[PDB]
Design an enzyme around this catalytic site. Structure first.
Site, short mmCIF file in Angstrom:
data_model
loop_
_atom_site.label_atom_id
_atom_site.label_comp_id
_atom_site.label_asym_id
_atom_site.label_seq_id
_atom_site.Cartn_x
_atom_site.Cartn_y
_atom_site.Cartn_z
N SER A 137 0.84 -1.19 0.00
CA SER A 137 0.00 0.00 0.00
C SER A 137 0.88 1.24 0.00
O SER A 137 2.02 1.22 0.47
CB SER A 137 -0.93 0.02 1.21
OG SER A 137 -1.68 1.21 1.22
N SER A 138 0.31 2.34 -0.50
CA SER A 138 1.02 3.62 -0.51
C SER A 138 1.28 4.13 0.90
O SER A 138 2.27 4.84 1.14
CB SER A 138 0.23 4.67 -1.28
OG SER A 138 -1.07 4.82 -0.70
N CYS A 139 0.42 3.80 1.86
CA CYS A 139 0.56 4.37 3.18
C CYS A 139 1.49 3.58 4.07
O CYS A 139 1.42 3.72 5.30
CB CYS A 139 -0.83 4.50 3.84
SG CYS A 139 -1.78 2.98 3.87
N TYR A 158 -0.91 -1.44 10.82
CA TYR A 158 -1.20 -1.93 9.48
C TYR A 158 0.05 -1.98 8.62
O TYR A 158 0.28 -2.96 7.89
CB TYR A 158 -2.25 -1.02 8.85
CG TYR A 158 -2.64 -1.39 7.45
CD1 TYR A 158 -3.49 -2.44 7.21
CD2 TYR A 158 -2.22 -0.62 6.38
CE1 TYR A 158 -3.90 -2.75 5.93
CE2 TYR A 158 -2.61 -0.92 5.10
CZ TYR A 158 -3.46 -2.00 4.88
OH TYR A 158 -3.85 -2.32 3.60
N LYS A 186 1.94 -5.13 6.59
CA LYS A 186 2.12 -5.21 5.14
C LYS A 186 3.59 -5.28 4.76
O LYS A 186 3.96 -5.94 3.77
CB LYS A 186 1.45 -4.02 4.44
CG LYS A 186 -0.11 -4.01 4.54
CD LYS A 186 -0.72 -5.20 3.80
CE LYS A 186 -2.05 -4.89 3.13
NZ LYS A 186 -2.43 -6.00 2.20
N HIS A 191 -12.97 6.99 2.34
CA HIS A 191 -12.58 7.27 0.96
C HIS A 191 -13.10 8.64 0.57
O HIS A 191 -14.32 8.84 0.45
CB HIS A 191 -13.10 6.17 0.04
CG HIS A 191 -12.45 4.84 0.27
ND1 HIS A 191 -12.59 3.78 -0.61
CD2 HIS A 191 -11.64 4.39 1.26
CE1 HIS A 191 -11.90 2.75 -0.17
NE2 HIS A 191 -11.32 3.09 0.97
#
Ligand SMILES: NC(=O)c1ccc[n+]([C@@H]2O[C@H](COP(=O)([O-])OP(=O)(O)OC[C@H]3O[C@@H](n4cnc5c(N)ncnc54)[C@H](OP(=O)(O)O)[C@@H]3O)[C@@H](O)[C@H]2O)c1
Ligand SMILES: NC(=O)c1ccc[n+]([C@@H]2O[C@H](COP(=O)([O-])OP(=O)(O)OC[C@H]3O[C@@H](n4cnc5c(N)ncnc54)[C@H](OP(=O)(O)O)[C@@H]3O)[C@@H](O)[C@H]2O)c1
Ligand SMILES: [Mg+2]
Ligand SMILES: [Mg+2]
Lengths: 286, 286
Positions: free
Chosen positions: B110-112, B139, B143, B182
Site C-alpha cells: 500500500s502507498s501508506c 497496518y 504489510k 474514501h
C-alpha cells in the site's frame, strides 16, 4: 513492584537456548511453577499446537526465548527461515497470550535490529528511523513485527506485554563451535590454541545471567509499552578485549543507551574479566 | 512474457473485497480455473485450515487480496487487529505457497506504508528508510513484513513471489457508507446531498480495474524481487477534484513514482472524469 512472580505459572519458551536456559536457572530460585516444552514436542511456529498448549497450561507469564539465531552467513543465506521461524513464534505466542489473558509476556528483540546508521549510543526510539542492515534484515523484520505486535496488544487491550532489547551475550551454554559467530568464544578458542601451540574498534558484552536477571526485573517493575535496552554499560575494544583474553590464557560502534533500564534501578553485576575467567575454566572442564 | 496465466489455477483470496472482486472480474475473461473461498468458510489467519486449503486445491498462482482495511479512526483504535489479521493472512498464505511450490504469488502492499516523510514522488526503495506514520503504523508493519517475507522466499528459494504497492483506489464495490474514509465517495455523497438540497493540496486516484489489470500484467511480465508501485500518474487537487465532482452533480503530497511499472509497458487507461461519471450514475441505480 507492579507485579510479583511468586505464585504465578511461568512459561519459559526456548528453555534449551542460551538465553532461555539462563532464565530457567534464575527462576529455579523463585516461588513459582515453571513450564517448559522441548523443541522436539512443540514447534512454536505451529499455531494450532501452540494455542492448545497455552490454553491448556494457562500460564500467567510467557517469556519468549525461543528463536532462530545465527551468524552473518546463515542470516544472509537463509533469510526466509530466519524471518518465518522467528515471526511465527512471536505471532503464535503473542496471539495465544492475548486470547486467554496471559498477565505478562516478554518478547526478546535484539541490538542488531536498530537502523544500521542510527546515532550511537542507540536509544530505543531509534527503532525504525532508518534502513536496516541488509545482511540480517530478515531476522530484524521478524523481531520488529513481534515487538510491534506486542505493542499493539498493550495499546488496544492493555495487555501487559513488553520487549527487551539485549546486546551481545556471553556466559553459560555459549557457542564454542569453530563456526561460532560469537567473537568472544572465538577469541578464547583462538588464543588457547595459540598458547598450547606456543606460537606467537569498540564493542559491548553482556553476561547472560545479568540479562536473565534484568528480564525478571522488567517483568516485576516495568509497565511501559516502548522497548527497553539491556546493555552492558561497560564497553571494551577489540584490542583491549584481546589483551584481556591473552592475559588469562597465558599467551605471549554498537553501544546501547541504557538510561531507561537504569532509571528502573538495574545495572549489570558481573564484571567482564570476572565472567571471562569463569568461562575460560569451564570450557576446559567441559 | 515470463509467465502465462492460461491453463493455470488461480486462487483469488479476498474475492469479495474491493480489489479482490476486481481481480475476479478481470479473470473471468482468461482461460484459467478460478478458485475462491468466502471469508465465512475459510479464515485466512488460521494456519491449519489455510494450509489444507492450499495443499488440496494446489493452485499455480495465489493472488492475496484478503486483508483488514479501514480509515484512520479504525487503524488508531484497533491496531492489534489491523496488525495481526493482515500479517497472519500473508504469513499463512506465503508459507503455504512456498511449501507446495506455488509458481506465482502476489501480495498487496500500500502507498501508506512508506515512511511518512519520504521524498515525493515515492520510489519503491523509499521503503523502511524512515519512521512510519503512527496512525496506521500497525497496518504498515503487517504489510511490510508480508512483503519482506515474500522477498526472502524469492531470495532463498527462487520462489516467484512479488508485491505490488497500489495507491488510492476508486471504482466498483467502493464504500459509500457515511463513515467511509474514501474521500472520493464522500465527495460524490456530500455534493449530491447538496444539489438535491439545492443549498450552496494534491492527490492521486487509481481505478480499481486499472489496478487489477496491472496486477495481472506484473504476474505475466515482472520477475523482480523488489516491489512495484501501481499509481495513477495523473494527479489532481482536492480543489480541482472538488470542481470535477460538483461539475457532474450539477451543484452550484502522496504521489508514487511509477517509473518501474511504466518500464514494463503499463499505464492506467481509465480517465478520472470518465471513471467518476461512471461511478456517479451507478451509485444512483444501486
Ligand atoms: N545482540 C543481541 O541483542 C542479542 C544477542 C543474543 C541473543 N539475543 C536475543 O535472545 C534471543 C535468543 O537467542 P539465543 O542466543 O538464546 O538463541 P539459541 O541459543 O539458539 O536458542 C533458541 C531456542 O529456541 C528454540 N527453538 C528454535 N526454534 C524453535 C521452534 N520452532 N519451536 C520451539 N522452540 C524453538 C531452540 O531449541 P533447540 O533446543 O531445538 O535448539 C532453543 O531452545 C534472540 O532471538 C534475541 O532476541 C539478543
Ligand atoms: N492506497 C493504497 O495503497 C491502497 C488502497 C486500497 C487498497 N490497497 C491494497 O488492497 C488491499 C485490499 O483492500 P480492499 O480495499 O480490497 O479491502 P476490502 O474491500 O475490505 O477487502 C478485504 C477482503 O478480505 C476479506 N477478508 C478479511 N479478513 C479475512 C480473513 N481473516 N480471512 C479471509 N478473508 C478475509 C474480506 O472478506 P469479507 O467479505 O468478509 O469482508 C474481503 O473479501 C489492501 O490491504 C491494500 O494492500 C491499497
Ligand atoms: Mg534462548
Ligand atoms: Mg480486496
Amino acid at each position: 513492584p507492579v507485579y510479583s512472580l511468586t505464585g504465578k505459572k511461568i512459561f519459559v519458551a526456548g528453555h534449551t537456548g542460551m538465553v532461555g536456559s539462563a532464565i530457567l536457572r534464575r527462576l529455579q530460585h523463585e516461588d513459582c511453577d515453571i513450564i517448559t516444552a522441548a523443541h522436539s514436542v512443540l514447534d512454536l511456529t505451529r499455531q494450532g499446537p501452540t494455542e492448545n498448549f497455552i490454553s491448556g497450561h494457562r500460564p500467567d507469564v510467557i517469556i519468549i526465548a525461543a528463536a532462530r539465531v545465527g551468524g552473518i552467513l546463515a542470516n544472509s543465506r537463509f533469510p526466509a527461515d530466519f524471518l518465518y521461524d522467528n515471526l511465527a513464534i512471536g505471532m503464535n505466542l503473542i496471539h495465544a497470550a492475548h486470547q486467554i489473558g496471559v498477565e505478562r509476556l516478554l518478547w526478546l528483540g535484539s541490538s542488531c535490529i536498530y537502523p544500521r546508521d542510527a546515532a550511537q549510543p542507540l536509544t530505543e526510539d531509534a527503532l525504525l528511523t532508518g534502513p536496516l542492515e541488509p545482511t540480517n534484515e530478515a531476522y530484524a523484520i521478524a523481531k520488529i513485527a513481534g515487538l510491534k505486535y506486542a505493542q499493539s496488544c498493550a495499546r488496544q487491550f492493555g495487555d501487559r506485554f513488553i520487549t527487551a532489547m539485549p546486546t551481545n551475550l556471553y556466559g553459560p551454554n555459549d557457542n564454542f563451535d569453530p563456526t561460532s559467530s560469537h567473537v568472544l568464544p572465538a577469541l578464547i578458542r583462538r588464543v588457547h590454541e595459540a598458547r598450547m601451540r606456543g606460537a606467537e574498534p569498540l564493542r559491548e558484552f553482556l553476561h547472560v545471567d545479568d540479562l536473565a536477571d534484568a528480564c525478571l526485573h522488567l517483568l516485576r517493575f516495568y509497565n511501559g509499552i516502548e522497548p527497553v535496552n539491556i546493555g552492558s554499560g561497560e564497553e571494551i575494544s577489540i584490542k583491549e578485549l584481546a589483551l584481556t583474553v591473552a592475559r588469562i590464557v597465558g599467551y605471549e560502534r554498537k553501544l546501547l543507551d541504557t538510561s531507561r533500564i537504569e532509571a528502573l534501578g538495574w545495572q549489570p553485576r558481573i564484571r567482564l574479566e570476572d565472567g571471562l575467567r569463569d568461562v575460560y575454566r569451564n570450557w576446559l572442564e567441559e
